[PDB]
Amino acid sequence: LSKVQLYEDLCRYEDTLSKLVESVDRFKPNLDIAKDLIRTDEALFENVKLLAEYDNIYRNLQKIDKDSEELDSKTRKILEILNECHDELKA
Amino acid sequence: FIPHIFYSLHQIRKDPNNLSNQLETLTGSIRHRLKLCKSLISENEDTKDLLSKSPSEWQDIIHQREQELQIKRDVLDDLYRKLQR
């Protein structure tokens, strides 16, 4: 799971750190910690990368939508003019 | 946003260090960076992975948008034809 797992790792990462840094209790040797704080980071990066394709499609959808709105804008812009002409001609 | 999330994660990976007043100032940033990262993840536009939407959907929305594009452009040519006329 990209996003979900991405959010779990961040949790357990902060956990492990907080212990290592002494905010919470942990036994004196406490390397398991340091090792974890590296496996988790690598997992996050890997997970984040695998997510790029998804964010790219979004990049596309944003393009498309921007276009679509721009166009509808031009159409609106023209209808305005017609009305403005209609005014100068009627009123 | 996905880029700021990458650069953000990058800076955090590079943050850990020493102890004391430093140890606290170093772990304080790590706590804020974790917040910042969680906010970016939340704000990622609904791509795939359920952050916003799956992939199946993203493909649908793209096909739906292409179709609306063809139409809005047909409308656009008509509007211009008439203005020009």
Among B44, B10, B56, B57, smallest CA distance to A3 is for: B44
Distance CA B80, CA B70 (A): 15
Distance CA B12, CA B14 (A): 5
* Resolution of the solved structure (Å): 15.3
For B40, residues 6+ apart whose C-beta sits below 8 A from its C-beta are B1, B4, B5, B8
* 3 state DSSP class of A34: helix
Question: In this structure, how many other beta carbons lie within 10 angstroms of the beta carbon of residue A72?
Answer: 14
State whether residue B71 sits within 8 Å of chain A by CB: no
State whether residue A85 sits within 8 Å of chain B by CB: no
Which ranges in B14-54 belong to alpha helices (H)?
21-43
Q: Which helix (H) or strand (E) holds B65?
A: helix B55-84
Q: Are A14 and B34 in contact (CB under 8 A)?
A: yes
State whether residue A11 sits within 8 Å of chain B by CB: no
Experimental method: cryo-EM
C-alpha distance across the termini of chain B, in Å? 45
> Is B47 buried (19+), middle (13-18) or exposed (0-12) by CB count in 10 A?
buried
State whether residue B13 sits within 8 Å of chain A by CB: yes
B4, B79, B80, B84: best to mutate for the A interface, most A CBs within 10 A: B79
**Token couple for B45:** 């536009």
* 3 state DSSP class of B9: helix
Q: Are A64 and B62 in contact (CB under 8 A)?
A: yes
Distance CA B56, CA A46 (A): 22
A13 with B76: Cβ contact below 8 A: no
For B76, residues 6+ apart whose C-beta sits below 8 A from its C-beta are A71, A74, A75
**Token couple for B76:** 């656009």
Which ranges in A1-91 belong to alpha helices (H)?
2-20, 31-50, 52-89
B13, B40, B72: best to mutate for the A interface, most A CBs within 10 A: B72
